[PDB]
Design a binder for these strands. Structure first.
Lengths: 186, 141, 130, 71, 50, 96, 138
RNA sequence: UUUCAAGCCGAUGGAAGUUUGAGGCAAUAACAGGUCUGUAUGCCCUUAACGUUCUGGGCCGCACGCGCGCUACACUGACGGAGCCAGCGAGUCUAACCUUGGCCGAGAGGUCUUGGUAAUCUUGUGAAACUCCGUCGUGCUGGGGAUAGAGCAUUGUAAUUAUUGCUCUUCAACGAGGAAUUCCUAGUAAGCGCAAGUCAUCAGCUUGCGUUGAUUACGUCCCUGCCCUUUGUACACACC
């Protein structure tokens, strides 16, 4: 539906087919994607997947102190940036990125003392959303801290490298890591 | 219109321009001994030099609440746990500001004293507020 | 030349004044805008007009938010700065004050003989600095 | 500090000063663990003996000091 | 001790318990009780108070 | 308004005295604004059962449920005197 | 008149709904003036939701005390919605229950029912708040 | 779905689901568990004094080690101005809480006048997180803050030892911490203010409250505690 009374999902093309069935843009699980602002700076790009789960993983990791009150400005104010930069819908570009950052098959760990037994478990739709946003935000909060960059610019730049495919990106690279070790130790 | 229709901050700035015109309100010279001795650069809205912007704020609060007290226009009514409380004991920095401002506004006919303690706002007062509120509202639309 | 003994220059005015005992980091900016210069402005960029306004405030009294202000002095007849106190003045007064009440048994004078706190702030864990 | 309206000068030591000063200055330190007194001009010369805790550390009371407490 | 009605200065004779001699943080509302200790005991006796 | 207020321990003594003022004092010559309930004049607190000593793991919740009724008598005429007939149920603290 | 209640996070939204005029009075000041920030599209939200636009149609006068800028914008909103179903037309107004249930559709924390939420503290024993811990399939 | 049992799994209806959330309840007994400093109390003791009174100094000592809290190493933001908002509780019975009006004046600070409230008033929208906008631009700084020195109150006797705090000035350790270890299961930790309790008077504590509020269980292999059945015993002052 209409996200901030302008952009919708009817002008958005969907990539992964099984995410159409499960995650619905009605409300469970809300397929409108946008995050990447702190303070006042209009950088370039926007993007961070599923707004319902930007209340989730994106909040606590941040990097920000303060919970949702911070988060809603991160989500809102970056929408206009990508709209005049690449001239795209802020949802459409990262509907490409969500499937690239979400694994198909993952690995559980079970700890038998000082032994890491990574065995394969299957994913399929729902977990792929929130674990992907966890992968985005953990790479983003540490990249804001460890070099001179605000969380505005970090979240923004990341997801076109995640969408197309690059080793610069954290989230597609850790998706690769977890997926290929599952199909190996299966 | 009324003072509600116009915004909070920019009404205080707009009213402060006309406040400087009226030569009953002078600066007794307190806030020029703070903002310069700091580091702080405040550009002309934020600037307050000073009795003009502060008089516009204080007079707006007699539209918004209206009931008595120079003290209840000094600090809102009780809570000066932020910055410094002063009720019975001898009045400080905040004291000598606000006793002067409502004294000077009284010599216009902006505020009068109502008989259950302290101030209200009278005829020429709310003229000088809400007529300027109309002009700002026409620039907003 | 502004100060007694020291002289600033070259670096940003807030950083350049920090090397004075009497003007620090969040104490340089106090005097700077009272002269009416900015913080980005370096001390080697100063015009004669700007140089005159800064030294006038800095040697005579400093302030912040002061609506009530007398100028009483020590009553003891050693010195009497008590306006603003720069380098060679702050190393003199604060030194020999400690020695006068140390000569007698003032209890602050005996805490100066010990090492322990003079004000007496919660004395158990503090003492790694003083 | 108590200056205006009743400075806190403890009345027992005013009796001590009026005795010991007009005779002869007593060169032995008189112990006086009273901290809460204002020091007055009849105490000048004579060695007052405020305690600290573990030790004592000799007074020479000067005509320049009067105004403060024993502090 | 404290129970003598003429201390030297105003604040010497502080507060004490009735039951015990104990001193260590009593109650203004009830001048009895050891410290905290007979507060909950004498609640279990009869009634309560804040 | 001639302010009468009642307060007692629990419900059982309170129901009788409250209803009796409506029956006895009120008739026709008195109009009351009437028999209200109100919140309780209670004082609750959670503390520990052992008073300090052994056992941080112990609790005891307390209250003082002292049930007030106001029941205000408006018309201040002849019939406001006839309250002196009801003196029943001690434990009810009447306050005027 | 038709009035109603509607609270979340402590609030008292005293929402009168009335025919004729269409000025939205919040206490003793209009809609834009009381809530000047960002979230105040929410108090204008169930108005245009019903089908036709407001201002022309129905008059709204609320009183409200209790609730922050996060709470109040839902309290007023919930009361306008709960008073919509209780309103009178000619067909009338009861089946707008289902469309206010279909307001926040298919994950039903709706505008018919309340946000039954009162943000109090953080818990002891695991990790906790609201929505239970540990799931691979979430 | 399960034997067409009990139950589970999800869904509908609603403000609310599987004892709704949180208290209150602690069987029978054991640990010769702790309390003789609460009072009660057997017996042992001491009695010109392990009684009592006066006052000071100690409990704040220190040359290191251990445990628990608080605060920071930051743009996770700081600094200046403006603006929107909660709930639980307190307040003389003859020393209250507090609104007001003027006057000392570098602070901690009450005699007096007037008005409200016995809780209708008042503490509390001069309530933060947060939001808007601007500036600083990653340097021990515009970071952080210990410590020291410098101007006073018609009362709280009075604050050197041993009070908080307000303005200028002093501007450290510290730049995310080894071996190792603890807590956090769905509005009840984190993060955030606000109020009570003792109190003439010294909170970061205890006690109570609301606001904004989520990452993650596939699975019990290993670890620690507890329960049931089966199983070996030479174990029995409690099964050191």
């Amino acid at each position: 539906i209409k996200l901030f009374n302008k952009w919708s999902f009817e002008e958005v093309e969907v990539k992964d087919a099984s995410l159409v069935d499960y995650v619905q843009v009605r409300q469970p699980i809300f397929v409108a994607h946008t995050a990447g602002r702190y303070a006042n700076k209009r950088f370039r790009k926007a993007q961070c997947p599923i707004i319902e789960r930007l209340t989730n993983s994106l909040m606590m990791n941040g990097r920000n102190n303060g919970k949702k009150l911070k988060a809603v400005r991160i989500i809102k104010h970056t929408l206009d940036i990508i709209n005049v930069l690449t001239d795209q819908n802020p949802i459409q570009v990262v509907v490409d990125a969500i499937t690239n950052t979400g694994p198909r098959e993952d690995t559980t760990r079970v700890g038998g003392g000082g032994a890491a037994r990574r065995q394969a478990v299957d994913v399929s739709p729902l977990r792929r959303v929130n674990q992907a946003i966890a992968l985005l935000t953990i790479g983003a909060r540490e990249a804001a801290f460890r070099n001179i960059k605000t969380i505005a610019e970090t979240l923004a730049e990341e997801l076109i490298n995640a969408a197309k495919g690059s080793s610069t990106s954290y989230a597609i690279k850790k998706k690769d890591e977890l997926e290929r070790v599952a199909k190996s130790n299966r | 219109v009324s003072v509600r229709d116009v915004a909070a901050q920019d009404f205080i700035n707009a009213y402060a321009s006309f406040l400087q015109r009226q030569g009953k309100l002078e600066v007794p010279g307190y806030v020029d001994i703070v903002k310069t001795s700091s580091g702080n650069e405040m550009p002309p809205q934020d600037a307050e030099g000073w009795f003009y912007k502060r008089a516009a704020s204080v007079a707006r609060h007699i539209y918004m609440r209206k009931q008595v007290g120079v003290g209840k226009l000094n600090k809102l009514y009780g809570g000066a746990k932020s910055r410094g409380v002063r009720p019975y004991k001898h009045i400080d920095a905040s004291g000598s500001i606000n006793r002067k401002v409502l004294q000077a506004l009284e010599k216009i006919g902006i505020v009068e004293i109502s008989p259950k303690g302290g101030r209200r706002i009278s005829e020429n007062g709310q003229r000088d507020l809400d007529r300027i509120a109309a002009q700002t509202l026409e620039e907003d639309e | 030349r502004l100060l007694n003994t020291n002289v600033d220059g070259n670096i940003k005015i807030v950083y350049a004044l920090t090397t004075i005992k009497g003007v620090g980091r969040r104490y340089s900016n106090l005097v700077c805008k009272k002269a009416d210069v900015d913080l980005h402005k370096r001390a080697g960029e100063l015009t004669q007009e700007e140089l005159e306004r800064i030294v006038q405030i800095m040697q005579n009294p400093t302030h912040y938010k002061i609506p009530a202000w007398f100028l009483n002095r020590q009553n003891d007849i050693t010195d009497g700065k008590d306006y603003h106190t720069l380098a060679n003045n702050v190393e003199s007064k604060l030194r020999d004050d400690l020695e006068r009440l140390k000569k007698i048994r003032a209890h602050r004078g005996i805490r100066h003989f010990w090492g322990l706190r003079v004000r007496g702030q919660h004395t158990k864990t503090t003492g790694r600095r003083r | 500090r108590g200056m205006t309206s009743k400075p806190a000068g403890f009345m027992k030591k005013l009796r001590a000063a009026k005795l010991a000063a007009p005779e002869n200055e007593k060169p032995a330190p008189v112990r006086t663990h009273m901290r809460n007194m204002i020091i007055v001009p009849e105490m000048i010369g004579s060695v007052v003996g405020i305690y600290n805790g573990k030790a004592f550390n000799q007074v020479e009371i000067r005509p320049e000091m009067l105004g403060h407490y024993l502090g | 001790n404290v129970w003598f009605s003429h201390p030297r200065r105003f604040g010497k004779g502080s507060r004490q318990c009735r039951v015990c001699s104990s001193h260590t943080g009593l109650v203004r509302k009830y001048d009895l009780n050891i410290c905290r200790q007979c507060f909950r005991e004498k609640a279990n006796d009869i009634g309560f108070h804040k | 308004k001639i302010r009468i207020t009642l307060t007692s321990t629990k419900v059982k003594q309170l129901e009788n005295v409250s209803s009796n003022i409506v029956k006895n004092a009120e008739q026709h010559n008195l109009v009351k604004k009437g028999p209200v309930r109100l919140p309780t004049k209670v004082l609750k607190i959670s503390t520990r059962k052992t008073p300090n000593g052994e056992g941080s793991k112990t609790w005891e919740t307390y209250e003082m449920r002292i049930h007030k009724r106001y029941i205000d008598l408006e018309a201040p005429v002849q019939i406001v005197k006839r309250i002196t007939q009801i003196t029943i149920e001690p434990g009810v603290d009447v306050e005027v | 008149s038709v009035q109603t209640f509607g609270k979340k996070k402590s609030a008292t939204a005293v929402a009168h709904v009335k025919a004729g005029k269409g000025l939205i009075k919040v206490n003793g000041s209009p809609i834009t003036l009381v809530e000047p920030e960002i979230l105040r599209f929410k108090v204008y939200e169930p108005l245009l939701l019903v089908g036709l636009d407001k201002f022309s149609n129905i008059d709204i006068r609320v009183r409200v005390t209790g609730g922050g800028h996060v709470s109040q914008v839902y309290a007023i909103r919930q009361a306008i919605a709960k008073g919509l179903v209780a309103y009178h037309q000619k067909y009338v107004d009861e089946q707008s229950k289902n469309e206010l249930k279909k307001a926040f559709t298919s994950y039903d924390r709706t505008l018919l029912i309340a946000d039954s939420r009162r943000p109090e503290p953080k818990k002891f024993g695991g990790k906790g708040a609201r929505s239970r811990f540990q799931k691979s399939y979430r």
